[PDB]
Amino acid sequence: RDMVENFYHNTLKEISEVKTKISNKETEAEEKESKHRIDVKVFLQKVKHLEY
Amino acid sequence: MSNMMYNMKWQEAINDLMEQVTLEYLPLEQNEQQLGMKYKRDSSEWFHFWATLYIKYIDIYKKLEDCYDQLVHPQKRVLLKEMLENVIVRLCETKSQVVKYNTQYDATYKSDYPNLDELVMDLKLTPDCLDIPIPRYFREEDKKRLDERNQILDALLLEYTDTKEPQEEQYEDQNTLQADMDTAIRIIQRYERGRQGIERANLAKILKKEEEKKLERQKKLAEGTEIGEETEKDDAALVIKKYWRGYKSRKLVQDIREEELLFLGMKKVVEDPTLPESQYKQAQNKRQKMKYIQEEHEQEFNDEIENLKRLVKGNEGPDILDKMRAERREWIMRELEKNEFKEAPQDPSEFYNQQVMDPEQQAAEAAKAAEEAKKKGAAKKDDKKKKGKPSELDEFLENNKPTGPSPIVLKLQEQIEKHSGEWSKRDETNNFEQKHETELAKMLIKPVVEEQIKQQVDEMIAEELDIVRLRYDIKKKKQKKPPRPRNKGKNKKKFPGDSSNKGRDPKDILAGLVEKRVAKKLIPASLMDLKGEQNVLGKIQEIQADENLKKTEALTDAKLKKAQLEEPSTKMPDPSIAQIRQIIAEYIAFPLGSKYAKEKLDKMNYFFFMGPRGSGKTLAVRALAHECNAIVLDISPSNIDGQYTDKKQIDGMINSAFKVAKEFQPAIIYCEDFEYIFGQAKKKKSQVNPLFAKMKKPLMDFKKGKFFEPEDRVVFIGSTNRPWDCSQKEIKSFFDKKIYFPFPNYGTRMLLFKTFLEQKKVPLPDNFPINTIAHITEGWSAGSFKMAIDRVFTERRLQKINEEQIKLSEFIGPLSNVPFTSKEEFKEFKKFNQVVTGLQANYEAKKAPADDQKGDKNKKKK
Amino acid sequence: EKKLLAFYQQERQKINYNWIIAKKELEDKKSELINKEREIQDLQENHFMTLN
Numbered sequence A: 001r002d003m004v005e006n007f008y009h010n011t012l013k014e015i016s017e018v019k020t021k022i023s024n025k026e027t028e029a030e031e032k033e034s035k036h037r038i039d040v041k042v043f044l045q046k047v048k049h050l051e052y
Numbered sequence B: 001m002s003n004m005m006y007n008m009k010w011q012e013a014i015n016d017l018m019e020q021v022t023l024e025y026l027p028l029e030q031n032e033q034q035l036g037m038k039y040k041r042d043s044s045e046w047f048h049f050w051a052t053l054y055i056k057y058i059d060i061y062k063k064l065e066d067c068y069d070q071l072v073h074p075q076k077r078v079l080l081k082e083m084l085e086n087v088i089v090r091l092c093e094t095k096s097q098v099v100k101y102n103t104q105y106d107a108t109y110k111s112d113y114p115n116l117d118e119l120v121m122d123l124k125l126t127p128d129c130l131d132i133p134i135p136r137y138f139r140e141e142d143k144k145r146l147d148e149r150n151q152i153l154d155a156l157l158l159e160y161t162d163t164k165e166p167q168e169e170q171y172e173d174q175n176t177l178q179a180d181m182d183t184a185i186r187i188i189q190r191y192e193r194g195r196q197g198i199e200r201a202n203l204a205k206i207l208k209k210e211e212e213k214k215l216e217r218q219k220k221l222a223e224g225t226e227i228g229e230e231t232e233k234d235d236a237a238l239v240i241k242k243y244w245r246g247y248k249s250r251k252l253v254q255d256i257r258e259e260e261l262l263f264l265g266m267k268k269v270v271e272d273p274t275l276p277e278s279q280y281k282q283a284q285n286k287r288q289k290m291k292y293i294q295e296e297h298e299q300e301f302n303d304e305i306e307n308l309k310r311l312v313k314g315n316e317g318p319d320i321l322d323k324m325r326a327e328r329r330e331w332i333m334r335e336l337e338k339n340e341f342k343e344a345p346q347d348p349s350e351f352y353n354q355q356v357m358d359p360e361q362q363a364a365e366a367a368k369a370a371e372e373a374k375k376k377g378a379a380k381k382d383d384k385k386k387k388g389k390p391s392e393l394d395e396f397l398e399n400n401k402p403t404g405p406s407p408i409v410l411k412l413q414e415q416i417e418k419h420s421g422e423w424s425k426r427d428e429t430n431n432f433e434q435k436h437e438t439e440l441a442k443m444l445i446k447p448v449v450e451e452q453i454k455q456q457v458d459e460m461i462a463e464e465l466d467i468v469r470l471r472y473d474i475k476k477k478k479q480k481k482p483p484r485p486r487n488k489g490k491n492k493k494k495f496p497g498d499s500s501n502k503g504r505d506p507k508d509i510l511a512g513l514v515e516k517r518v519a520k521k522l523i524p525a526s527l528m529d530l531k532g533e534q535n536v537l538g539k540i541q542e543i544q545a546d547e548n549l550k551k552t553e554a555l556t557d558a559k560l561k562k563a564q565l566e567e568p569s570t571k572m573p574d575p576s577i578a579q580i581r582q583i584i585a586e587y588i589a590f591p592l593g594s595k596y597a598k599e600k601l602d603k604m605n606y607f608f609f610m611g612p613r614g615s616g617k618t619l620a621v622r623a624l625a626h627e628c629n630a631i632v633l634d635i636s637p638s639n640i641d642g643q644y645t646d647k648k649q650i651d652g653m654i655n656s657a658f659k660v661a662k663e664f665q666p667a668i669i670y671c672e673d674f675e676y677i678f679g680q681a682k683k684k685k686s687q688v689n690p691l692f693a694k695m696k697k698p699l700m701d702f703k704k705g706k707f708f709e710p711e712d713r714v715v716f717i718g719s720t721n722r723p724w725d726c727s728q729k730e731i732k733s734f735f736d737k738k739i740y741f742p743f744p745n746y747g748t749r750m751l752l753f754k755t756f757l758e759q760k761k762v763p764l765p766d767n768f769p770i771n772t773i774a775h776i777t778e779g780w781s782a783g784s785f786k787m788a789i790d791r792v793f794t795e796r797r798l799q800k801i802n803e804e805q806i807k808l809s810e811f812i813g814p815l816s817n818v819p820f821t822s823k824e825e826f827k828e829f830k831k832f833n834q835v836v837t838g839l840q841a842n843y844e845a846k847k848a849p850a851d852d853q854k855g856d857k858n859k860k861k862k
Numbered sequence C: 001e002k003k004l005l006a007f008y009q010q011e012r013q014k015i016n017y018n019w020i021i022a023k024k025e026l027e028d029k030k031s032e033l034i035n036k037e038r039e040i041q042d043l044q045e046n047h048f049m050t051l052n
Helices: A002-049 B002-033 B043-069 B074-100 B117-122 B143-161 B181-221 B230-265 B279-339 B350-355 B359-380 B392-400 B407-424 B438-471 B506-515 B538-553 B558-566 B577-593 B595-600 B617-628 B647-663 B690-705 B728-734 B746-759 B770-776 B782-792 B795-799 B808-817 B823-836 B839-845 C002-051
Strands: B606-610 B631-634 B667-671 B714-720 B737-740
Touching: A002 B230, A002 B279, A002 C002, B002 B043, B002 B407, B043 B074, B043 B117, B074 B279, B074 B407, B074 B577, B074 B595, B117 B538, B143 B506, B279 B350, B279 B438, B506 B647, B538 B558, B577 B595, B577 B617, B577 B714, B577 B737, B606 B823, B617 B631, B617 B667, B617 B714, B631 B647, B647 B667, B647 B690, B690 B728, B728 B823, B737 B823, B746 B770, B746 B782, B746 C002, B770 B808, B770 C002, B782 B808, B823 B839
Parallel strands: B606 B714, B606 B737, B631 B667, B667 B714
Antiparallel strands: none
């Protein structure tokens, strides 16, 4: 019983760890997508700097 | 992270709902393909089917409620809420259906606590899979009115009560000594003098022993005995070194043992909530951010819809408005041609009447109307026939016909398909924030602008039609006024207290109630706060009960059988704490907390409760009040004693409380000590105030009048401590349902002990025999448990828990000090539960044979 | 003693079932994390291609 209690507790802890990993993964993905859109707009504005 | 996970969870929940819909459609289609013959499906199979359906719907409820709790798409949230309420309704209906078919053991148990443990284990789930905590969205949804109500309540409390903290259950301690300070001083003086005399005489005994040892040593030295002293130090050092090395070995052994405990997994690594980095803290922060996200999307989506409707009306308002003006003009011209300018329309409303007939719609409605009115034609010929009694088979088939798709089933399924078609096929990659889509906004806003245009054009073409009819000077055929609305003096059921509260607005009555202390802000509580276990072995208890009853049937001695049946049938397992939590949640939170469930479920608002003092009735009341944010008005004689001394005041207070409940939705009324109002009149002279007993007539007429509207989400609470005092027939016929709280069992009682000990922040011992204390404590209610736990541990005792581990005898003293419930009280509780609930009615039903006839009854007329 | 044995057995079986569920959820979430990492790499590759 002690074995199973702590195995369950550590499995839940690792589940929370994977959850935090995933949340940080969406954080980084959103950061990178924001930069992607930003640089796309910056290139379209370079198509105005080229008018200059 | 949260959005995608909740999308997947809703996906799984909809998969579960589709699984249940296909499963339940299976019986209907199978019957359609085999309608020729009858079905010999035992109640066992139906019980399994409905229990699996109930558990799957419980899982669906959990997932959907959590999603709505952290679903941020307001358009998605509205669908989730409606689907959740529909699923909750069909869940309550499934619970009721399981209740009806509780015919196990060849019996007719209509138990509100059906046992699903056998299916639960057969389905590979633990008992907690049945948990149904009350949803917390009952507060946020339409929170304005309840927040205003609570603001007014707190203002009144400061107006008279002078306190704001929620009142806690103050239990008077019977350990108070009615003695003057002199008596206590003398007692303490006697204690101190006795202990000092003991100490001094012990010192005298010590000195006597010292004298004896000195004499013995002197006598020994008189014999010229030489004792080596150098070797004594060496021996002492050797012994101390051996013991120290052994202690090092032992401490290292338990260090390795605890390393195995933490690594191989003996002791759980408990996370402290107070620490900054606790995982629960991160989860709470994420949930708080996510919830604020749902409100932010709600507010901005409302603003977007408002602006969109404004712009839509501005741009496409005049044009289609003028087009429909022209349509109304053409209809008016056609009307005039049909009447040749003699009789003209008064309202363009009939324009819709002529265009309601949809080709396919006219077909469906014409067929339905012909079929319906056909049944009315035959109701004229056969009247002289007799009024023959209903046949047994007719009603057996009517109430045994397998129910088809319930309308709420249609609602939930169709919502599922529509969500799949619209939102599932929605590309959120561009809308990475899962916010509202302009397309849905336009689609659901078009009705508002269209109906605004229709109303404006109806008014405008009404003026146009007036002028056109005046153009031909067509006299307005006198509009025969509909029969004057005679406000008949209908004998609306008159209730006590109307005279003293006529002409007063609700706020004044609320102020009076607050000043009268009838209404109080009870401490917030949660339904999951009711630590309880599922009926793991309740079914086996029932099997043993049935077998023992059958063995009793085989008995020969009439006296022995009579004696055994006189005592309550203890073999029956009492309702589980988990089952009681389920029943209370389903009957209160959803009806009290949801309007749609109230409409779609049984229209009951009267609950009675029977249990020992402090057994948890207050805990349930607090949990329900906090979850539903409902005012709790306690009209208990104890809570009102010393303030009411006449019938008029009681009548007025009851009337005011009922009016507040009707208008101050949601509202709940709790009343303890119900025995004194509905107890045994023939009993001896009870010390309680007779005035309390007079409440029966006002409440009797209220109940017989159906005061609270069935949909109105207000319930009356009745909980007592000694069920036998009240009249059983009146309890049966006056409350919608009754609940008996069982005494804690070995497992539940031990788990409650563990929960309280962890609550007090006392360390957990590894070798402590919990079940031993559980056995020692059998026969006590939950209130006695809490009182003993509070008594055992004090401020310095809790601060000293580390030095002294918890000791068994610590609970020996308090257990006797707290009130004790004898086995006789439990037996009477069980008897009252069986009788008032009607279980004994079923027991008598399934024993009387049908051989006895109905012969002569007319000779004995003298 | 018998009663405690029975209770410990039942509660041990309960936490065994709980630990099985936890392991299943942990495996599913680890697979989800792997797929999230693959999504991040795909976003990066398409980002480089669009920049080019």
